[PDB]
Design a protein around this nucleic acid. Sequence first.
DNA 1: CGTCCAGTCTAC
DNA 2: TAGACCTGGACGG
Length: 270
Amino acid sequence: PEGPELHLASQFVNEACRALVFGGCVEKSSVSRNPEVPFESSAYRISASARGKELRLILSPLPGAQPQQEPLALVFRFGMSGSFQLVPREELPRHAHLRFYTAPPGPRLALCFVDIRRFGRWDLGGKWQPGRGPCVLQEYQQFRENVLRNLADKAFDRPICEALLDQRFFNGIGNYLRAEILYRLKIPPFEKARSVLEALQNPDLLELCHSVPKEVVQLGGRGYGSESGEEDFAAFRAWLRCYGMPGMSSLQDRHGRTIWFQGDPGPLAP
DNA sequence: CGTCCAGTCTAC
DNA sequence: TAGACCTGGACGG
């Protein structure tokens, strides 16, 4: 998942947990190489926020919840399959690697981090990854400045399609958004990144880095996702103009990732 | 049955 | 850089 999916997953946790109270421990699957969450409360609320391709849960005990516990923050990266679901406690999906359990009164639910391929990670401590740039969705001006002020970096020597995956400058952009953004401006994907960015130093490339992903969020649904039904998933495939679409070209970048585009591949093409 | 395809992370 | 980390669906024989 990319920035829109991290964002929608955060909105899901906030809306679906608004009136839920969790209790007990935070349970990790035995196969998961991620750390155990040292947290226990008779009564805590779960809330979320997204920044780029990371999501932060806050575990907030209620007044007088036992054991005495301070709020705990967990930050998640989703890799290729990460996901959050609210399921009935005894109908855990396969690959539910981390689980928060509702307290009574009510139907016993589990909020689960579900990750088929286990590329996802969480760290104890609530901090965003050092080095990740501002969120293209929620910190646009900070995102735009962090790019324009550092065009000297060797990161911008590379093809624009490669630079757009560097989470130090485009936190929240992944393989589908880089195709959709470049297609909107018909920028050849193997144009040099510094060449296309220097001008800014009729929406430009950095505006689209915000507004294109915002469109996926505004579809509602769960972006490149089905944790909302088939309706929302087909809604997303219909929004796509370029990623995977018939009559589009594709090449491998230097990291073996597929870039979709129309027309001129650009000068630094392999 | 088999191949091929779908975001970091780190050891060369 | 390239291979590693994973599972599963879509396809081909």
